[PDB]
Amino acid sequence: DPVRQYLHEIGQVPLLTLEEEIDLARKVEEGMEAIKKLSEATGLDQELIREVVRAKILGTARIQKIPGLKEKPDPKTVEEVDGKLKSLPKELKRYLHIAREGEAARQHLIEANLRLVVSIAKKYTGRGLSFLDLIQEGNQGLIRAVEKFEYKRRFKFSTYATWWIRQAINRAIADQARTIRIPVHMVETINKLSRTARQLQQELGREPSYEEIAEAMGPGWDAKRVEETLKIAQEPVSLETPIGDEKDSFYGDFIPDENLPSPVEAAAQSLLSEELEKALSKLSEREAMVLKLRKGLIDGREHTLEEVGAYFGVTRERIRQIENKALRKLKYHESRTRKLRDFLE
């Protein structure tokens, strides 16, 4: 059981007393301001030196080689900035150390409040997303809450954290739970719809109609709109969904293929092309060529008027008269043979 594993793993790392909390926050902010001061030192960006320090902290070679096969070279752009930051006087140096310690503090803080996140994610199940996924989204929301936190406001970090964890988990339901992608706006919309529907179903004693629920939704809401949003809200169906009491049948294998031509269809198209080819041959050579230039029987494209006139060297009007005439001659011979009178669907 993975849940047991992770829960025990975070059960290992203890909580944090107010002293520890405030001290860690302090050390973090000191670290960041140290990074900024180092940005005024060597003249490089904050996140640059930050990610370098991380690369010296949360693992040696493992931060670089696998966030995908290509990021920032190990011996080259990492180590040269490292050595460049190495070559500074005493104050900037002590600030380097301070920065590193800040990073570590950030990590620990993150852990205790991972326990917190686990509580919050424990609140949110039923999703359309699994428990551990909830935990992890909440954990990212936790790293996020840690980054922007300010201890000077003298508030317990737990509250600020909770808000961020919650919003992160909601970002999960919005971005995940449904097989098809439904963006945030209509997710919230659907939620409001269902909520209100529940409310007036409680009131009226029965399910509503699109009209009354639309009116209960306020302005801009009609029957068609709630019907449409409800049409989007519905989920796909599993192809493996069992049909009947039989164990030999699925739902998906009862689905026909209209994308693929049936033998009768291929034969139909064949006979059409052939019979049309033979019914074409009784025309004059030029008019037939013109026709099959118009139809796409040559390159598949449609050569207009002027194009045909350009290829045969004549005017476009002549081409027009030509094709009309062809059409009527085919009218005669087809009025006779009745071979092509079909294919009329």
Binding site: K93, R94, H97, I98, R100
Partner: protein, 56 residues
């Protein structure tokens, strides 16, 4: 569990890396760690701590 090494002038080593007995600690070769272990540079006490562990 550790061995303490107070310094004076800056430091060569940084928090978290690896040192072997005889390797150079702070003050330009003034103090060396005689023991295998991870090294932590402490600002407040102005000291270099070597906690014995193997880099494994």
């Amino acid at each position: 569990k550790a061995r303490v090494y107070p310094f004076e002038d800056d430091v060569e080593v940084t928090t978290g890396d690896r040192v072997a007995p005889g390797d150079v600690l702070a003050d330009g070769g003034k103090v060396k760690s005689e023991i295998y272990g991870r090294v932590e540079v402490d600002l407040v006490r102005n000291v270099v701590r070597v906690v014995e562990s193997y880099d494994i």
